[PDB]
Amino acid sequence: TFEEFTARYEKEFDEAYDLFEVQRVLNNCFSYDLVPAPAVIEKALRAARRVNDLPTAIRVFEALKYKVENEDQYKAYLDELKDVRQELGVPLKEELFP
């Protein structure tokens, strides 16, 4: 179920000891048909800070932008995640202009 899904990837991300494991779990979370809940994404951001990789945190929203499938739902994820993203320092792709 969705709640079981969210509560079990909330535990997978808390145990990721390298940069190979973080990029392995996030490739599993976004490989499922469902778009992940905003509670899931917040834990993924914390993992990238833990393994010290800025570019994977940037790709989190890039993965979400193609995954969320809605232009307002991307804004919905955007609003709730403003505090954590600004506190961490992750820039969006459009703002970064790479």
């Binding site: 048909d33 778009v35 969320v68 739902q73």
Partner: peptide, 10 residues
């Protein structure tokens, strides 16, 4: 937050 699911199904 709307639980977007089953996009593939339909």
């Amino acid at each position: 937050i709307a639980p977007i699911t089953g996009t593939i199904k339909r």
